[PDB]
Amino acid sequence: GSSGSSGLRKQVEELFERKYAQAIKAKGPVTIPYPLFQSHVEDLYVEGLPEGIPFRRPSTYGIPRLERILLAKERIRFVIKKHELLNSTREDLSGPSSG
């Protein structure tokens, strides 16, 4: 039972952020606001997703569900209609360093 080194979730986790970061040309690790997006799904929403797989924490999706998301990565896309909507919320991350 060894996990960590390369994992679907991680793959998606990095992907999700990646796409998002791309939408903001971010060469760094960014966080995806589930609320800001949930409260504003008419502005902030993920696209290119496969069928039967919405835009939610990849820490829930099934092993097979993730794979697809990775297979749709080519299509996957993050539309940031409202940018400001993002800004303002708490500011400052503060925590450990991941890379």
Curated annotation (Swiss-Prot):
The modification Phosphotyrosine is found at residue 45. The modification Phosphoserine is found at residue 59. GTF2I-like repeats lie at residues 8-93. It comes from the Eukaryota. It is found in: Cytoplasm; Nucleus. There is a cross-link at residues 27, 82 (Glycyl lysine isopeptide (Lys-Gly) (interchain with G-Cter in SUMO2)). Ubiquitous. Isoform 1 is strongly expressed in fetal brain, weakly in adult brain, muscle, and lymphoblasts and is almost undetectable in other adult tissues, while the other isoforms are equally expressed in all adult tissues. Transiently phosphorylated on tyrosine residues by BTK in response to B-cell receptor stimulation. Belongs to the TFII-I family. Interacts with the basal transcription machinery by coordinating the formation of a multiprotein complex at the C-FOS promoter, and linking specific signal responsive activator complexes. Promotes the formation of stable high-order complexes of SRF and PHOX1 and interacts cooperatively with PHOX1 to promote serum-inducible transcription of a reporter gene deriven by the C-FOS serum response element (SRE). Acts as a coregulator for USF1 by binding independently two promoter elements, a pyrimidine-rich initiator (Inr) and an upstream E-box. It is linked to GTF2I is located in the Williams-Beuren syndrome (WBS) critical region. WBS results from a hemizygous deletion of several genes on chromosome 7q11.23, thought to arise as a consequence of unequal crossing over between highly homologous low-copy repeat sequences flanking the deleted region. Haploinsufficiency of GTF2I may be the cause of certain cardiovascular and musculo-skeletal abnormalities observed in the disease. Homodimer (Potential). Interacts with SRF and PHOX1. Binds a pyrimidine-rich initiator (Inr) and a recognition site (E-box) for upstream stimulatory factor 1 (USF1). Associates with the PH domain of Bruton's tyrosine kinase (BTK). May be a component of a BHC histone deacetylase complex that contains HDAC1, HDAC2, HMG20B/BRAF35, KDM1A, RCOR1/CoREST, PHF21A/BHC80, ZMYM2, ZNF217, ZMYM3, GSE1 and GTF2I. Interacts with BTK and ARID3A. Interacts with isoform beta of PRKG1. Interacts with GPR50 (C-TERMINAL DOMAIN). This is General transcription factor II-I. It comes from Homo sapiens. The lineage of its organism: Eukaryota, Metazoa, Chordata, Craniata, Vertebrata. The gene is GTF2I. The chain holds residues 361 to 446 of 998 of the full protein.
